[PDB]
Ligand binder design. Structure first.
Ligand SMILES: *[C@@H]1O[C@H](CO)[C@@H](O[C@@H]2O[C@H](CO)[C@@H](O[C@@H]3O[C@H](CO[C@H]4O[C@H](CO)[C@@H](O)[C@H](O[C@H]5O[C@H](CO)[C@@H](O)[C@H](O)[C@@H]5O)[C@@H]4O)[C@@H](O)[C@H](O[C@H]4O[C@H](CO)[C@@H](O)[C@H](O)[C@@H]4O[C@H]4O[C@H](CO)[C@@H](O)[C@H](O)[C@@H]4O[C@H]4O[C@H](CO)[C@@H](O)[C@H](O)[C@@H]4O)[C@@H]3O)[C@H](O)[C@H]2NC(C)=O)[C@H](O)[C@H]1NC(C)=O
Ligand SMILES: *[C@@H]1O[C@H](CO)[C@@H](O[C@@H]2O[C@H](CO)[C@@H](O[C@@H]3O[C@H](CO)[C@@H](O)[C@H](O[C@H]4O[C@H](CO)[C@@H](O)[C@H](O)[C@@H]4O[C@H]4O[C@H](CO)[C@@H](O)[C@H](O)[C@@H]4O)[C@@H]3O)[C@H](O)[C@H]2NC(C)=O)[C@H](O)[C@H]1NC(C)=O
Ligand SMILES: *[C@H]1O[C@H](CO)[C@@H](O)[C@H](O)[C@@H]1O
Ligand SMILES: *[C@H]1O[C@H](CO)[C@@H](O)[C@H](O)[C@@H]1O
Ligand SMILES: *[C@H]1O[C@H](CO)[C@@H](O)[C@H](O)[C@@H]1O
Ligand SMILES: *[C@H]1O[C@H](CO)[C@@H](O)[C@H](O)[C@@H]1O
Ligand SMILES: *[C@H]1O[C@H](CO)[C@@H](O)[C@H](O)[C@@H]1O
Ligand SMILES: *[C@H]1O[C@H](CO)[C@@H](O)[C@H](O)[C@@H]1O
Ligand SMILES: *[C@H]1O[C@H](CO)[C@@H](O)[C@H](O)[C@@H]1O
Ligand SMILES: *[C@H]1O[C@H](CO)[C@@H](O)[C@H](O)[C@@H]1O
Ligand SMILES: *[C@H]1O[C@H](CO)[C@@H](O)[C@H](O)[C@@H]1O
Ligand SMILES: *[C@H]1O[C@H](CO)[C@@H](O)[C@H](O)[C@@H]1O
Length: 470
């Protein structure tokens, strides 16, 4: 009633607010070059008036999925993005140059110049997210007969990013929250995905990605160590508990609708991902006043990690939305498989929502199934309701909402907040992204090796774009 209605409305605001934060015509970010996704129009306290490789990557992947589903008007946005990245790849910055680490730089000025101050650099997820975003578009181009655009523009750009991933996966760097210098789940996860899809894309254009093939399996091997037996460790080399929404994002951004509940890939329905979901959400239940009085079968306001002090440590729109997207993903998966399984690892997740939960396999026509899925759906919607309750009356989504009063704080009109809304809504509606080949990339090697593979670097020049019609 309320929710379905607010969601449809919000999806429209979310799409518009995103376009507003992209240069060089975006109404809120005058100054940004063409195809430059700005984190937020906020230039002071905090200053988010910059472009991050991760942020743009996530946003554009969302735009490509909408485009592929019929939002044909986004073509020019996507093209401008690709053109801008051809340039960014080549900008010399504190992380290096194209072939010497430059690709790992977290952010840049909106005018495409380097950000020279001190920053937690590099962030190795960047290159992986950008490649994933471009491959999505490249696939479309191949399908609609624009072979040249795909082979000559997209592939070469992707090849650079894939080379960086294969070369440095096994080195520490900063996490997505830009604070912990170590080895992070989200990064490893998204890096594994990029090499797999990168390899298939290379073959599709009549080329190859040898470095994608040898490293993918090794990245997967390494990923297995993040499981502690109870939850997914967010980062190695950290002194925190390790419970972080970082792990929810890694699962949802690597969700493959063709996958079963694979533990090796931390799929949304995997017993390990469900157990983790419970550990992570529960960690915020007693630390936010906003969560006072809700029981364990009720949705709560979710933050990044329980130890967060940023602006005092508050719930985040995107974190709360991720908690719900993982559930929508799992519902979809169970629905396609036609059954759901409860194991000892995931019993606690299930039991908190359906007290008669017991291990076993439940077909989709069973009473237990019916009872579990209704409860999960209601819990997932609960998180979305929290968002809706704290959004501004006109739909504006901020970075955070106050731990005590629910007021919006930190960066205003955060692009990422809007993209997280769009994807949660899509999933809720059974609108899933194209598969990335998880069904042929979930096998763990017998022994993990600390290794790398050196690919190849070459500067791309985007002279012109063919007259593409959608
Ligand atoms: C729903 O309704 C909302 C309520 O109205 C609406 O939000 C409002 O949106 C307008 C824009 O449409 C925002 O206006 C901007 O306000 C800036 C000042 O903000 C501070 O002070 C305000 C007033 O007291 C506060 O309310 C405001 O708080 C908000 O932001 C906080 C921080 O993120 C947040 O924590 C709070 O919770 C709250 O959300 C904040 O404290 C003002 O600076 C800005 O002016 C720029 O833009 C104008 C045009 O857009 C230009 O004319 C002007 O000259 C400024 O341009 C400079 O900055 C731009 C980027 O923002 C660049 O593009 C320009 O090139 C230029 O940049 C130069 O200067 C920079 C200086 O540092 C430099 O870095 C650059 O490199 C360059 O040299 C503008 O007036 C208003 O703040 C919003 N209000 C609220 C409450 O959020 C919302 O959008 C609606 N949503 C939807 C979905 O429709
Ligand atoms: C490059 O690749 C290699 C090969 O894949 C990576 O090497 C693997 O590294 C992992 C992590 O060190 C390692 O697993 C550890 O094995 C120990 C036993 O042999 C465990 O004692 C250790 O436990 C920690 O992590 C557990 C989760 O697996 C937690 O349950 C446990 O509490 C420990 O976690 C705490 O302590 C760590 C210290 O490791 C701390 O940083 C955490 O934040 C937390 O506080 C691990 O399970 C594998 O043995 C290694 N594999 C091989 C073949 O050597 C290497 O790490 C990669 N390097 C980079 C930078 O990418
Ligand atoms: C993930 O992919 C592996 C192969 O690499 C399968 O064996 C597994 O069943 C899942 O599909
Ligand atoms: C499944 O496939 C992986 C990927 O190559 C192998 O390394 C593994 O040993 C298993 O056969
Ligand atoms: C890292 O190590 C692997 C296996 O030990 C090598 O095959 C690889 O080429 C790199 O040296
Ligand atoms: C990645 O780093 C390895 C070391 O594990 C080198 O052997 C390889 O050549 C590449 O530079
Ligand atoms: C890894 O190493 C190879 C071979 O030295 C280079 O060609 C590549 O650019 C990267 O530095
Ligand atoms: C690595 O490989 C690419 C593609 O073959 C070359 O163009 C590049 O110069 C480097 O040799
Ligand atoms: C490496 O490859 C890029 C992309 O084809 C070229 O632009 C460059 O000239 C070099 O051959
Ligand atoms: C590839 O890199 C060169 C710099 O070496 C740029 O001039 C080009 O625009 C592209 O970014
Ligand atoms: C794309 O191509 C131009 C030459 O046409 C180079 O200057 C640029 O560095 C990139 O290789
Ligand atoms: C302009 O230059 C680039 C790189 O040299 C080509 O890829 C493009 O087709 C046009 O000739």
């Amino acid at each position: 009633a309320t929710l379905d209605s607010w969601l449809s409305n919000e999806a429209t605001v979310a799409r518009t607010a995103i376009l507003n934060n992209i240069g060089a015509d975006g109404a809120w970010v005058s100054g940004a070059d063409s195809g430059i996704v700005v984190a937020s129009p906020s230039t002071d306290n905090p200053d988010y008036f910059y472009t991050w490789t991760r942020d743009s990557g996530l946003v554009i992947k969302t735009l490509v999925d909408l485009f592929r589903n019929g939002d044909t008007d986004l073509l020019s946005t996507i093209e401008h993005y690709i053109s801008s990245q051809a340039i960014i790849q080549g900008v010399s910055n504190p992380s290096g140059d194209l072939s010497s680490g430059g690709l790992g730089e977290p952010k840049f000025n909106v005018d495409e110049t380097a950000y020279t101050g001190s920053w937690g650099r590099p962030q190795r997820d960047g290159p992986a997210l950008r490649a994933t975003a471009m491959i999505g578009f490249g696939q479309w181009l191949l399908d609609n007969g624009y072979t040249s655009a795909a082979t000559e523009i997209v592939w070469p750009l992707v090849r650079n990013d894939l080379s960086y991933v294969a070369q440095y996966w096994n080195q520490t760097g900063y996490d997505l929250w830009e604070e912990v210098n170590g080895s992070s789940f989200f990064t490893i996860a998204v890096q594994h995905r990029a090499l797999v899809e990168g390899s298939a894309f290379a073959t599709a254009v009549g080329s190859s990605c040898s470095w994608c093939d040898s490293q993918a399996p090794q990245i997967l091997c390494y990923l297995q160590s993040f499981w502690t037996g109870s939850y997914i460790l967010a980062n190695f080399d950290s002194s925190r508990s390790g419970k972080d929404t970082n792990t929810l994002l890694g699962s949802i951004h690597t969700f493959d609708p063709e996958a079963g509940c694979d533990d090796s890939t931390f799929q949304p329905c995997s017993p390990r991902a469900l157990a983790n979901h419970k550990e992570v959400v529960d960690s915020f239940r007693s630390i936010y006043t906003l969560n006072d009085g809700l029981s364990d079968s009720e949705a709560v306001a979710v933050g990044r990690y329980p130890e967060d002090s940023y602006y005092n440590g508050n719930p985040w729109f995107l974190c709360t939305l991720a908690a719900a997207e993982q559930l929508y993903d799992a519902l979809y998966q169970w629905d396609k498989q036609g059954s759901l399984e409860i194991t000892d690892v995931s019993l606690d997740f299930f039991k908190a929502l359906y007290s008669g939960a017991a291990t076993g396999t439940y077909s989709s026509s069973s009473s237990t199934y019916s009872s579990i899925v209704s409860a999960v759906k209601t819990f997932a919607d609960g998180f979305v309701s929290i968002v809706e309750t704290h959004a501004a009356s006109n739909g504006s989504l901020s970075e955070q909402f106050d731990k005590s009063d629910g007021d919006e704080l930190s960066a205003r009109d955060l692009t990422w907040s809007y993209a997280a809304l769009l994807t949660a809504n899509n999933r809720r509606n059974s609108v899933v992204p194209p598969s990335w080949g998880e069904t042929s990339a979930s096998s763990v090697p017998g022994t993990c090796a600390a290794t790398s593979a050196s690919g190849t670097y070459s500067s791309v020049t985007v002279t012109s774009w063919p007259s593409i019609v959608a």
